[PDB]
Amino acid sequence: LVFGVARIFASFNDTFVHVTDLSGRETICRVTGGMKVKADRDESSPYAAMLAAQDVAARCKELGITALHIKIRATGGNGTKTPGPGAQSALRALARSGMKIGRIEDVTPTPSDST
Amino acid sequence: KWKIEPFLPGPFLEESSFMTLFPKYRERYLKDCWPLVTKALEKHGIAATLDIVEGSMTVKTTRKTYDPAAILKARDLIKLLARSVPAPQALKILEDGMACDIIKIRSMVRNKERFVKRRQRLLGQNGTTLKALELLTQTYILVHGNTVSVMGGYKGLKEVRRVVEDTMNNIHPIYLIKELMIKRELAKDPALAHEDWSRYL
Amino acid sequence: NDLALQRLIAESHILSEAGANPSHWQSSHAATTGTNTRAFATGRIAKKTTDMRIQALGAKESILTQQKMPMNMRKGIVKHQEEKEKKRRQEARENGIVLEREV
Amino acid sequence: TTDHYLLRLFAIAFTKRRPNQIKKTTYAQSSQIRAIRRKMVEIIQREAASCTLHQLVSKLIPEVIGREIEKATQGIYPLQNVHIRKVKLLKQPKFDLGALMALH
Amino acid sequence: IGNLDLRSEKQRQAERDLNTALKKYLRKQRKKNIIDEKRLKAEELYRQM
Amino acid sequence: PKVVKKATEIKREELAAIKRREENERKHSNKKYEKRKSEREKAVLVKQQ
Amino acid sequence: EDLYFLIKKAVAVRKHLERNRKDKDSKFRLILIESRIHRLARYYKTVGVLPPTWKYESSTASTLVA
RNA sequence: GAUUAAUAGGGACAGUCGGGGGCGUCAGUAUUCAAUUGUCAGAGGUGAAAUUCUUGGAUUUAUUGAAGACUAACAACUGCGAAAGCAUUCGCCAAGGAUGUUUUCAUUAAUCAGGAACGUAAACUAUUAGGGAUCGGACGGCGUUUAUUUUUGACCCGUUCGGCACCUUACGAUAGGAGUAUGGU
């Protein structure tokens, strides 16, 4: 079981399913939400997150890591500090297609004082 | 494209667990509203314990939990139960299309009496503007001290975010409710489906 | 100046206690309560809103309220309603929730 | 440390609610908070200036520092839990494979 | 009519003067799952037993 | 009458407060190891000839 | 003397104000303490314990610290 | 030759108290900008879009560096300042409040004409008589924890001054519009 670290940037406009190694430096495979949906309205949707998570899990099972540590974030500076629908739907599809999940953490950038 | 299916069917290696801390006046209400919470979290597969000695709610993923987003649902649920949302609403976050949000509004007004006036202006006469916002945005809004805790669909989360910031920035919520009613009337007919609607507000 | 804005603000209590907000817990309970899943619930809400509209137009007394009670029923009803509002005010003074100010 | 690594230690310490009490707020006074912070920085300096980095990590793992802060601050105001929330290594001036392989 | 309410008399006198079951106790109170410091004392008693 | 009713409610509140203060001072002072002096005995301050 | 301690507080306030020069709370307290000095000084003039031509503006402060 | 020492003053000392003020210093993230890598097709907004940035690689991932801002959560039916206002640590500088004292001159005082210092908004509105809370002293103590035992502090309780606010009671008080017509301009 080779643990890869999946950054899921779930905003309200698009979701980013991103898979890196344990370092954070070397991106293995990323599929954004809007490259699976023709409509910019429905770019941030549970269907978009499901398609992105299925493609990412397929690539990472072709590479043979079959285990992820998932770090979920959102727009946190002056944003909302809550993930969009992409987080729940991508984690659901990601563990529904293989991918024994390891450690889940919501690493949102929380400002001590922004404005 | 937007609907979400319930999870049909061990997806967890490290046994995840989350904790939140509550005070005593919430300890009473949580002690006599807890069996509803642990009943629904047992239906989702997550063990939920409450500690009146230290004052801590814990959730933890059991052996037979299958939904992996259930731990995020449970973490948000115990966050809202600590932040004194009532118990059926906190359990209503466990549906698929709901999400919560906390809006920090104390940073937006330098003054104090002006802040109290604008917060009560957000709350309205007899709560009528607040429940009008809840109707027009399909949300649950709770004006919680220095914060505002909202729940609902993500569209309603965005609209109540805009309305709460514009209420704190001295635009009136009755003006914003009139704006939202105009937007609802325009989105009713799809003959005007893609124009710039700024000529009406 | 605007009419339907004034109607939406006043009748929001009745609509949001009837059925119109499925993310609110009281409305999601009152959407399955039974007196709103019956056959003509929308018409009964329409009668309540029309009574409130004539009250806003200037009627001093209502059509929907009952006028004669045996004094123990009305004292129990008024005392229970006042104790409920007082308990909600106290459980909102604790937890720091701010509420609508009304005497 | 004695191996000339500069590092920052960020400690957090929450106030103990005493059992068999009735008052809801366990507020320490501001002068009492300043005395607690003075004893906290005195403890972490006196028990992190003497050891090397490997012994410092071996003391950080079972949280001996937070335990000794909890033990020695309870004559000023009892503290519910003392943790060290961050360690940040700023500069490491040496690359020595001898000690770096004596680790592994 | 006129006999004692024994529960009320015991409560009145209270407000005036003021190894086989402790396992099914934990069996009934592991199901709540409120931790409830009397159960902490019962856990220490069961560990001593 | 309303004045007498309001003032006897105030008197009940004040007497209950004084009894609670005396009971707390008894439970946390050195008077705990004494017999409770009855109220008819407390009615007289001193007697002299 | 009460007047002696009051003018000592006045010189201390004015010296801190000369070193810092930016704050206004010390200037307001200086106005309060100079009004207090002048009132107590006027009562001691109309009694007569001190010279009626004795005055304190800043030079008496300077010549009593010097 | 010089009164009560005021349940009005001003001062002194002691332990203090405060997100009161000034100057320096220390941090914390977040945002922007730049650099180094892994990138490899969109990203961004919106109810939808569009302007814009995008194979010289945008958005993203990681690590540093700089700049400016602000001080989350704690954070209150609280604290301080006369007011606007005041929340990172530490140091320095004066000042201020209350308490206690086995502290002093003994009317110094109260009020404001004149004058003097500090400075995008609005939009639902002699006691009351105590009680429950609250914080700042001072005193007292059956006791739990510091405490290897004395300090001392935390918790509980009582007394006493002082102050922000709650509720009850008052002790009382008191301060033209809308329609419909008709005739002119």
PDB file of C-alpha atoms in Angstrom, chain B residues 1-186:
ATOM      1  CA  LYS B   1     -25.863  16.758 -13.507  1.00  0.00           C
ATOM      2  CA  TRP B   2     -26.512  18.078 -10.003  1.00  0.00           C
ATOM      3  CA  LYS B   3     -28.407  15.283  -8.242  1.00  0.00           C
ATOM      4  CA  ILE B   4     -26.462  13.059  -5.860  1.00  0.00           C
ATOM      5  CA  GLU B   5     -27.187   9.385  -5.232  1.00  0.00           C
ATOM      6  CA  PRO B   6     -27.137   7.733  -1.798  1.00  0.00           C
ATOM      7  CA  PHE B   7     -24.238   5.378  -1.158  1.00  0.00           C
ATOM      8  CA  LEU B   8     -25.306   1.796  -1.850  1.00  0.00           C
ATOM      9  CA  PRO B   9     -22.796  -0.384   0.015  1.00  0.00           C
ATOM     10  CA  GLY B  10     -13.513  -1.511   4.534  1.00  0.00           C
ATOM     11  CA  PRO B  11     -12.612   1.870   3.040  1.00  0.00           C
ATOM     12  CA  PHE B  12     -10.733   3.117   6.125  1.00  0.00           C
ATOM     13  CA  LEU B  13      -7.291   1.905   7.184  1.00  0.00           C
ATOM     14  CA  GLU B  14      -6.494   4.413   9.920  1.00  0.00           C
ATOM     15  CA  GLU B  15      -9.476   4.645  12.257  1.00  0.00           C
ATOM     16  CA  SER B  16     -10.378   8.324  11.951  1.00  0.00           C
ATOM     17  CA  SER B  17     -11.849  10.300  14.830  1.00  0.00           C
ATOM     18  CA  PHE B  18     -12.802  13.911  15.522  1.00  0.00           C
ATOM     19  CA  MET B  19     -13.539  15.898  18.673  1.00  0.00           C
ATOM     20  CA  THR B  20     -15.167  19.209  19.600  1.00  0.00           C
ATOM     21  CA  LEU B  21     -15.496  20.953  22.973  1.00  0.00           C
ATOM     22  CA  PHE B  22     -18.673  22.466  24.440  1.00  0.00           C
ATOM     23  CA  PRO B  23     -19.545  24.387  27.636  1.00  0.00           C
ATOM     24  CA  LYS B  24     -21.996  23.402  30.394  1.00  0.00           C
ATOM     25  CA  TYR B  25     -25.177  25.168  29.260  1.00  0.00           C
ATOM     26  CA  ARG B  26     -24.819  23.178  26.053  1.00  0.00           C
ATOM     27  CA  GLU B  27     -23.898  20.062  28.076  1.00  0.00           C
ATOM     28  CA  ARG B  28     -27.436  19.916  29.506  1.00  0.00           C
ATOM     29  CA  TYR B  29     -29.168  20.177  26.115  1.00  0.00           C
ATOM     30  CA  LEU B  30     -26.742  17.784  24.458  1.00  0.00           C
ATOM     31  CA  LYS B  31     -27.245  15.250  27.254  1.00  0.00           C
ATOM     32  CA  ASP B  32     -30.984  15.169  26.663  1.00  0.00           C
ATOM     33  CA  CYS B  33     -30.868  15.440  22.857  1.00  0.00           C
ATOM     34  CA  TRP B  34     -28.053  12.925  22.280  1.00  0.00           C
ATOM     35  CA  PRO B  35     -29.948   9.639  21.480  1.00  0.00           C
ATOM     36  CA  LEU B  36     -31.363  11.138  18.280  1.00  0.00           C
ATOM     37  CA  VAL B  37     -27.809  12.062  17.264  1.00  0.00           C
ATOM     38  CA  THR B  38     -26.280   8.669  17.981  1.00  0.00           C
ATOM     39  CA  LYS B  39     -29.258   6.910  16.373  1.00  0.00           C
ATOM     40  CA  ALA B  40     -28.765   8.710  13.063  1.00  0.00           C
ATOM     41  CA  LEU B  41     -24.993   8.397  13.257  1.00  0.00           C
ATOM     42  CA  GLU B  42     -25.389   4.664  13.879  1.00  0.00           C
ATOM     43  CA  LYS B  43     -27.546   4.562  10.755  1.00  0.00           C
ATOM     44  CA  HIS B  44     -24.611   6.202   8.977  1.00  0.00           C
ATOM     45  CA  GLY B  45     -22.075   3.873  10.632  1.00  0.00           C
ATOM     46  CA  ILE B  46     -20.128   6.236  12.916  1.00  0.00           C
ATOM     47  CA  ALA B  47     -19.819   5.911  16.685  1.00  0.00           C
ATOM     48  CA  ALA B  48     -20.589   9.138  18.548  1.00  0.00           C
ATOM     49  CA  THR B  49     -19.755   9.575  22.223  1.00  0.00           C
ATOM     50  CA  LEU B  50     -20.365  12.505  24.539  1.00  0.00           C
ATOM     51  CA  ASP B  51     -18.243  13.385  27.567  1.00  0.00           C
ATOM     52  CA  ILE B  52     -19.940  15.571  30.174  1.00  0.00           C
ATOM     53  CA  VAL B  53     -16.864  15.347  32.419  1.00  0.00           C
ATOM     54  CA  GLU B  54     -14.461  17.099  30.057  1.00  0.00           C
ATOM     55  CA  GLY B  55     -17.194  18.483  27.817  1.00  0.00           C
ATOM     56  CA  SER B  56     -16.314  16.832  24.525  1.00  0.00           C
ATOM     57  CA  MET B  57     -18.207  15.321  21.616  1.00  0.00           C
ATOM     58  CA  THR B  58     -16.270  12.659  19.725  1.00  0.00           C
ATOM     59  CA  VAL B  59     -17.081  10.892  16.478  1.00  0.00           C
ATOM     60  CA  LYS B  60     -15.081   7.940  15.231  1.00  0.00           C
ATOM     61  CA  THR B  61     -15.315   5.711  12.182  1.00  0.00           C
ATOM     62  CA  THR B  62     -16.160   2.132  13.107  1.00  0.00           C
ATOM     63  CA  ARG B  63     -15.305  -1.106  11.307  1.00  0.00           C
ATOM     64  CA  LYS B  64     -18.537  -1.162   9.300  1.00  0.00           C
ATOM     65  CA  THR B  65     -18.674   2.412   8.031  1.00  0.00           C
ATOM     66  CA  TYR B  66     -18.847   2.445   4.234  1.00  0.00           C
ATOM     67  CA  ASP B  67     -19.625   6.040   3.266  1.00  0.00           C
ATOM     68  CA  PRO B  68     -16.326   7.961   3.446  1.00  0.00           C
ATOM     69  CA  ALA B  69     -17.913  11.411   3.334  1.00  0.00           C
ATOM     70  CA  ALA B  70     -19.865  10.412   6.450  1.00  0.00           C
ATOM     71  CA  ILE B  71     -16.932  11.419   8.635  1.00  0.00           C
ATOM     72  CA  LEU B  72     -17.019  14.939   7.165  1.00  0.00           C
ATOM     73  CA  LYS B  73     -20.787  15.037   7.697  1.00  0.00           C
ATOM     74  CA  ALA B  74     -20.276  13.952  11.316  1.00  0.00           C
ATOM     75  CA  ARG B  75     -17.468  16.462  11.919  1.00  0.00           C
ATOM     76  CA  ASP B  76     -19.672  19.296  10.685  1.00  0.00           C
ATOM     77  CA  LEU B  77     -22.549  17.908  12.776  1.00  0.00           C
ATOM     78  CA  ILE B  78     -20.578  18.002  16.010  1.00  0.00           C
ATOM     79  CA  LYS B  79     -19.237  21.452  15.105  1.00  0.00           C
ATOM     80  CA  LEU B  80     -22.790  22.776  14.810  1.00  0.00           C
ATOM     81  CA  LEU B  81     -23.940  20.948  17.943  1.00  0.00           C
ATOM     82  CA  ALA B  82     -21.082  22.625  19.804  1.00  0.00           C
ATOM     83  CA  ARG B  83     -22.060  25.976  18.249  1.00  0.00           C
ATOM     84  CA  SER B  84     -25.623  25.542  19.581  1.00  0.00           C
ATOM     85  CA  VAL B  85     -27.635  24.897  16.444  1.00  0.00           C
ATOM     86  CA  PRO B  86     -30.758  22.934  17.512  1.00  0.00           C
ATOM     87  CA  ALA B  87     -30.581  19.184  17.214  1.00  0.00           C
ATOM     88  CA  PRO B  88     -32.955  18.371  14.269  1.00  0.00           C
ATOM     89  CA  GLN B  89     -31.208  21.005  12.142  1.00  0.00           C
ATOM     90  CA  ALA B  90     -27.764  19.747  13.111  1.00  0.00           C
ATOM     91  CA  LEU B  91     -28.992  16.301  12.107  1.00  0.00           C
ATOM     92  CA  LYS B  92     -30.396  17.791   8.903  1.00  0.00           C
ATOM     93  CA  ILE B  93     -26.829  18.459   7.809  1.00  0.00           C
ATOM     94  CA  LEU B  94     -26.490  14.647   7.419  1.00  0.00           C
ATOM     95  CA  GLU B  95     -28.480  14.704   4.177  1.00  0.00           C
ATOM     96  CA  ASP B  96     -26.597  14.725   0.899  1.00  0.00           C
ATOM     97  CA  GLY B  97     -27.283  18.214  -0.445  1.00  0.00           C
ATOM     98  CA  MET B  98     -26.817  20.238   2.735  1.00  0.00           C
ATOM     99  CA  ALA B  99     -23.789  22.174   3.929  1.00  0.00           C
ATOM    100  CA  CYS B 100     -23.073  24.608   6.740  1.00  0.00           C
ATOM    101  CA  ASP B 101     -21.148  27.861   6.848  1.00  0.00           C
ATOM    102  CA  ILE B 102     -20.000  30.284   9.526  1.00  0.00           C
ATOM    103  CA  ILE B 103     -19.780  33.968   8.636  1.00  0.00           C
ATOM    104  CA  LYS B 104     -17.543  36.098  10.854  1.00  0.00           C
ATOM    105  CA  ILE B 105     -19.160  39.541  10.917  1.00  0.00           C
ATOM    106  CA  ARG B 106     -17.445  41.176  13.910  1.00  0.00           C
ATOM    107  CA  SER B 107     -14.537  42.297  11.715  1.00  0.00           C
ATOM    108  CA  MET B 108     -16.833  44.318   9.439  1.00  0.00           C
ATOM    109  CA  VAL B 109     -17.910  47.171  11.742  1.00  0.00           C
ATOM    110  CA  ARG B 110     -15.381  49.188  13.727  1.00  0.00           C
ATOM    111  CA  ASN B 111     -17.999  50.706  16.045  1.00  0.00           C
ATOM    112  CA  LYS B 112     -20.019  48.806  18.651  1.00  0.00           C
ATOM    113  CA  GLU B 113     -23.425  50.506  18.750  1.00  0.00           C
ATOM    114  CA  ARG B 114     -23.408  50.625  14.948  1.00  0.00           C
ATOM    115  CA  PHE B 115     -22.638  46.893  14.945  1.00  0.00           C
ATOM    116  CA  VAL B 116     -25.506  46.150  17.345  1.00  0.00           C
ATOM    117  CA  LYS B 117     -27.873  48.236  15.202  1.00  0.00           C
ATOM    118  CA  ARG B 118     -26.796  46.521  11.984  1.00  0.00           C
ATOM    119  CA  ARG B 119     -27.036  43.032  13.485  1.00  0.00           C
ATOM    120  CA  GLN B 120     -30.557  43.745  14.749  1.00  0.00           C
ATOM    121  CA  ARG B 121     -31.295  45.205  11.311  1.00  0.00           C
ATOM    122  CA  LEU B 122     -30.221  41.871   9.835  1.00  0.00           C
ATOM    123  CA  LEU B 123     -32.534  40.102  12.261  1.00  0.00           C
ATOM    124  CA  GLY B 124     -35.477  42.361  11.431  1.00  0.00           C
ATOM    125  CA  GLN B 125     -38.790  43.241  13.023  1.00  0.00           C
ATOM    126  CA  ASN B 126     -40.141  40.105  14.770  1.00  0.00           C
ATOM    127  CA  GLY B 127     -37.721  37.974  12.745  1.00  0.00           C
ATOM    128  CA  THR B 128     -39.689  38.640   9.563  1.00  0.00           C
ATOM    129  CA  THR B 129     -36.726  39.720   7.440  1.00  0.00           C
ATOM    130  CA  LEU B 130     -34.707  36.744   8.695  1.00  0.00           C
ATOM    131  CA  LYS B 131     -37.377  34.196   7.833  1.00  0.00           C
ATOM    132  CA  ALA B 132     -37.968  36.015   4.552  1.00  0.00           C
ATOM    133  CA  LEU B 133     -34.285  35.498   3.779  1.00  0.00           C
ATOM    134  CA  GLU B 134     -34.596  31.856   4.843  1.00  0.00           C
ATOM    135  CA  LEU B 135     -37.559  31.413   2.483  1.00  0.00           C
ATOM    136  CA  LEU B 136     -36.029  33.206  -0.501  1.00  0.00           C
ATOM    137  CA  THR B 137     -32.672  31.454  -0.128  1.00  0.00           C
ATOM    138  CA  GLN B 138     -33.851  28.024   1.182  1.00  0.00           C
ATOM    139  CA  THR B 139     -31.403  28.293   4.080  1.00  0.00           C
ATOM    140  CA  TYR B 140     -31.381  28.156   7.859  1.00  0.00           C
ATOM    141  CA  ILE B 141     -29.831  31.338   9.248  1.00  0.00           C
ATOM    142  CA  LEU B 142     -28.864  31.692  12.910  1.00  0.00           C
ATOM    143  CA  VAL B 143     -27.502  35.089  13.931  1.00  0.00           C
ATOM    144  CA  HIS B 144     -25.104  33.740  16.533  1.00  0.00           C
ATOM    145  CA  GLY B 145     -23.488  36.471  18.602  1.00  0.00           C
ATOM    146  CA  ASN B 146     -20.536  37.704  16.551  1.00  0.00           C
ATOM    147  CA  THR B 147     -21.017  35.083  13.815  1.00  0.00           C
ATOM    148  CA  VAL B 148     -23.852  33.982  11.540  1.00  0.00           C
ATOM    149  CA  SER B 149     -24.339  30.244  11.029  1.00  0.00           C
ATOM    150  CA  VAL B 150     -26.187  29.262   7.851  1.00  0.00           C
ATOM    151  CA  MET B 151     -27.122  25.870   6.430  1.00  0.00           C
ATOM    152  CA  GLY B 152     -28.551  24.673   3.171  1.00  0.00           C
ATOM    153  CA  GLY B 153     -27.688  24.127  -0.436  1.00  0.00           C
ATOM    154  CA  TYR B 154     -24.561  25.688  -1.846  1.00  0.00           C
ATOM    155  CA  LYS B 155     -26.472  28.222  -3.939  1.00  0.00           C
ATOM    156  CA  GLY B 156     -28.294  29.436  -0.846  1.00  0.00           C
ATOM    157  CA  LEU B 157     -24.985  29.528   1.035  1.00  0.00           C
ATOM    158  CA  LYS B 158     -23.588  31.897  -1.594  1.00  0.00           C
ATOM    159  CA  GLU B 159     -26.650  34.171  -1.606  1.00  0.00           C
ATOM    160  CA  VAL B 160     -26.801  34.444   2.188  1.00  0.00           C
ATOM    161  CA  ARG B 161     -23.057  35.173   2.181  1.00  0.00           C
ATOM    162  CA  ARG B 162     -23.659  38.113  -0.179  1.00  0.00           C
ATOM    163  CA  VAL B 163     -26.689  39.306   1.800  1.00  0.00           C
ATOM    164  CA  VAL B 164     -24.899  39.149   5.168  1.00  0.00           C
ATOM    165  CA  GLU B 165     -21.873  41.102   3.903  1.00  0.00           C
ATOM    166  CA  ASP B 166     -24.115  43.698   2.265  1.00  0.00           C
ATOM    167  CA  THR B 167     -26.200  43.985   5.434  1.00  0.00           C
ATOM    168  CA  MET B 168     -23.073  44.642   7.472  1.00  0.00           C
ATOM    169  CA  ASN B 169     -21.923  47.212   4.873  1.00  0.00           C
ATOM    170  CA  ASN B 170     -25.037  49.396   5.523  1.00  0.00           C
ATOM    171  CA  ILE B 171     -27.112  48.213   2.552  1.00  0.00           C
ATOM    172  CA  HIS B 172     -30.507  47.321   3.954  1.00  0.00           C
ATOM    173  CA  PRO B 173     -31.702  43.695   4.012  1.00  0.00           C
ATOM    174  CA  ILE B 174     -35.151  44.839   2.872  1.00  0.00           C
ATOM    175  CA  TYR B 175     -33.420  46.179  -0.248  1.00  0.00           C
ATOM    176  CA  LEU B 176     -31.586  42.858  -0.576  1.00  0.00           C
ATOM    177  CA  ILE B 177     -34.833  40.897  -0.134  1.00  0.00           C
ATOM    178  CA  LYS B 178     -36.430  43.019  -2.873  1.00  0.00           C
ATOM    179  CA  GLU B 179     -33.398  42.215  -5.039  1.00  0.00           C
ATOM    180  CA  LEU B 180     -33.773  38.481  -4.370  1.00  0.00           C
ATOM    181  CA  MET B 181     -37.504  38.576  -5.081  1.00  0.00           C
ATOM    182  CA  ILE B 182     -36.784  40.252  -8.425  1.00  0.00           C
ATOM    183  CA  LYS B 183     -34.143  37.586  -9.191  1.00  0.00           C
ATOM    184  CA  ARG B 184     -36.631  34.821  -8.343  1.00  0.00           C
ATOM    185  CA  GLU B 185     -39.251  36.401 -10.620  1.00  0.00           C
ATOM    186  CA  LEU B 186     -36.718  36.680 -13.451  1.00  0.00           C
TER     187      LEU B 186
END
